[PDB]
Amino acid sequence: NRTCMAMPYFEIPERHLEAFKAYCAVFIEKTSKEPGCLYYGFSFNGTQGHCREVYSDAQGLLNHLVNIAELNSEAFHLASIVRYEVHGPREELDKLRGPLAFMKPQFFELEQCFSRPSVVA
Amino acid sequence: VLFQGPMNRTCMAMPYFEIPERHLEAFKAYCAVFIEKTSKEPGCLYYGFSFNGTQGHCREVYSDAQGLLNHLVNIAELNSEAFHLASIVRYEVHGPREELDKLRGPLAFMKPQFFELEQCFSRPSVVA
Amino acid sequence: VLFQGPMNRTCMAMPYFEIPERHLEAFKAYCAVFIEKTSKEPGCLYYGFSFNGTQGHCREVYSDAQGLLNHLVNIAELNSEAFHLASIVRYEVHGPREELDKLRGPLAFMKPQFFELEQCFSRPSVVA
Amino acid sequence: NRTCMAMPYFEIPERHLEAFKAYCAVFIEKTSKEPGCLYYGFSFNGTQGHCREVYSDAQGLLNHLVNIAELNSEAFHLASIVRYEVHGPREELDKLRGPLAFMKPQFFELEQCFSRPSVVA
Numbered sequence: 001n002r003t004c005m006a007m008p009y010f011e012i013p014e015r016h017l018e019a020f021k022a023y024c025a026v027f028i029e030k031t032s033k034e035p036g037c038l039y040y041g042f043s044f045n046g047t048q049g050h051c052r053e054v055y056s057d058a059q060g061l062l063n064h065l066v067n068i069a070e071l072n073s074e075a076f077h078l079a080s081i082v083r084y085e086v087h088g089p090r091e092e093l094d095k096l097r098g099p100l101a102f103m104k105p106q107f108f109e110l111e112q113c114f115s116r117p118s119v120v121a
Numbered sequence: 122v123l124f125q126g127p128m129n130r131t132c133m134a135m136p137y138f139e140i141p142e143r144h145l146e147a148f149k150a151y152c153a154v155f156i157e158k159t160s161k162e163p164g165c166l167y168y169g170f171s172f173n174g175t176q177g178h179c180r181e182v183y184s185d186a187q188g189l190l191n192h193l194v195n196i197a198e199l200n201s202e203a204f205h206l207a208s209i210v211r212y213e214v215h216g217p218r219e220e221l222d223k224l225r226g227p228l229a230f231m232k233p234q235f236f237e238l239e240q241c242f243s244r245p246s247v248v249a
Numbered sequence: 250v251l252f253q254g255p256m257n258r259t260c261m262a263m264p265y266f267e268i269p270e271r272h273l274e275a276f277k278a279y280c281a282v283f284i285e286k287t288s289k290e291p292g293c294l295y296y297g298f299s300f301n302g303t304q305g306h307c308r309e310v311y312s313d314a315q316g317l318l319n320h321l322v323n324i325a326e327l328n329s330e331a332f333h334l335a336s337i338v339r340y341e342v343h344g345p346r347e348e349l350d351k352l353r354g355p356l357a358f359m360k361p362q363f364f365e366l367e368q369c370f371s372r373p374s375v376v377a
Numbered sequence: 378n379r380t381c382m383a384m385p386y387f388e389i390p391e392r393h394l395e396a397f398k399a400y401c402a403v404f405i406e407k408t409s410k411e412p413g414c415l416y417y418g419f420s421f422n423g424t425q426g427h428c429r430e431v432y433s434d435a436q437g438l439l440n441h442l443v444n445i446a447e448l449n450s451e452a453f454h455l456a457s458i459v460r461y462e463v464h465g466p467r468e469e470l471d472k473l474r475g476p477l478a479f480m481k482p483q484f485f486e487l488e489q490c491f492s493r494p495s496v497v498a
Contacts, residue, residue: 005180021239021240024239024240025123025240025254028240028241028242028252028254031242032242032250032252037242038243038244038247038248039241039242039243039244039248040241040242040243041238041240041241041242041243042238042239042240042241043215043216043236043237043238043239044236044237044239045234045235045236045237048234048236050215050236052133052215054248087171087178087180106173106176107173108171108172108173108176108178109171109172109173110169110170110171111149111152111170111171111172112149112152112153112156112169112170113156113167113168113169113170114156114159114160114165114167114168114169115166115167115168115169116165116166116167118166118246118247118249119166119167119182119247119248119249120247120248121167121180121247121248122370122371122372122409123369123370123371123372123373124252124253124254124369124370124405124409125252125253125254125255125256125257125368125369125370125371126252126253126254126367126368126369126402126405127253127367127368128253129253239254239255240253240254240255241251241252241253241254242250242251242252242253243250243251243253244250244251245251251402261429277488277489280488280489281489284489284490284491287491288491293491293493294492294493294495294496295490295491295492295493295496295498296490296491296492297487297489297490297491297492298487298488298489298490299464299485299486299487299488300485300486300488301483301484301485301486304483304485306464306485308382308464308498310496343420343427343429344420362422362425363422364420364421364422364425364427365420365421365422366418366419366420367398367401367419367420367421368398368401368402368405368418368419369405369416369417369418369419370405370408370409370414370416370417370418371415371416371417371418372415372416374495375415375495375496375497375498376415376416376431376496376497376498377495377496
């Protein structure tokens with residue numbers, strides 16, 4: 001199981017919350033074209049935003065960053081990413097520590113796990 | 122084009138642990154005990170521990186809010202005996218509003234950060 | 250593949266009228282009066298009358314539940330004077346649960362059939 | 378404005394309600410491929426189901442019936458259609474009275490209307 005999970009946390013000014021949520025549907029449409037993306041969901045604690053992103057492997061996360069780059073530049077003025085976590089097995093995170101350094105990610109290496117045959121992450 | 126519909130009932134809990142270095146290996150050993158206990162819960166879909174050095178984390182995925190409540194009851198005794206190895210510094214709960222409404226009362230003692238899931242894409246054969 | 254997200258706030262009201270034949274042409278004339286009055290409501294997106302012989306119908310589309318309540322206030326006086334031309338035999342209200350919750354109290358006197366909108370596809374440029 | 382609106386009403390046994398709602402997502406996926414379908418939404422009054430279907434013209438409704446026929450036969454045992462209304466201008470409903478007779482439709486001819494430039498139905 002090489003699945004990796006990325007989690008950006010967003011600080012959204014209250015005047016930008018509705019525009020941010022409208023863009024979420026655009027990010028979801030664009031990300032839905034990625035074969036390696038298994039899950040992409042936006043959740044909110046008031047003005048604190050969050051995305052739970054599941055990719056089939058490290059390459060999937062790298063594909064997503066390239067795929068989403070143009071949308072990122074369009075919407076980058078609506079919020080600040082205040083934290084970025086990447087969770088997965090060490091052998092996949094090893095492929096990401098170099099490429100992702102610009103995000104200052106917090107890397108969590110998955111070491112012990114239970115899961116049902118239906119649910120990979 | 123726009124697609125709209127109800128979210129899955131799935132809820133995810135994420136405690137973040139501050140583990141003293143002198144307790145880190147004992148904490149990791151106990152993780153096997155917590156996994157074994159949780160693996161018998163019908164409502165638990167995923168339960169896994171990850172580490173950023175001495176920062177620990179558990180990703181807990183339940184089929185609905187009731188699954189998370191069942192876990193709280195199941196693990197209460199174990200939580201109280203491994204209590205001393207770490208402290209929980211953040212506790213997040215993610216899920217749809219209607220399920221999180223069932224959790225705000227029972228989990229108040231954890232002072233959780235509740236994130237209401239509002240928009241999602243998924244491949245349902247592999248992730249809920 | 251599965252897409253999930255919130256419904257539009259749009260609400261639709263549909264009264265069905267039983268119109269005596271002797272009143273049908275007068276009813277149709279008054280429809281112009283009701284359309285003119287309703288056309289000044291900011292919250293009204295669509296308001297149209299259709300007929301299956303002497304069975305009349307209005308399709309009323311509002312941007313949210315508040316729009317429907319504003320219409321009730323706006324039309325109250327007109328409703329009371331054209332009151333005698335027909336009877337309402339069915340009154341349906343369609344929309345998302347959170348908006349319909351705002352209507353169950355104010356519209357109780359109409360004994361409405363409330364249909365909660367749960368899944369939808371749409372082309373947002375032309376239909377809400 | 379040639380738009381027509383179709384409205385099936387469903388009586389769903391309580392034991393079939395969840396399966397019916399799961400099929401709704403399949404009907405929505407299939408109907409989303411129709412260029413002439415502008416809106417397709419399912420609503421529920423307990424066990425009473427309803428679809429609000431908006432088509433750009435009478436041909437769109439006929440295309441939908443053909444497009445959805447295979448799914449109809451798969452799911453036809455989950456509920457009964459107890460009423461079927463078709464609303465639109467007379468000139469479009471004239472094209473449907475023959476083809477749709479098997480549904481025993483209730484035809485409502487739209488005669489007077491207000492709408493904002495953004496909303497066709």
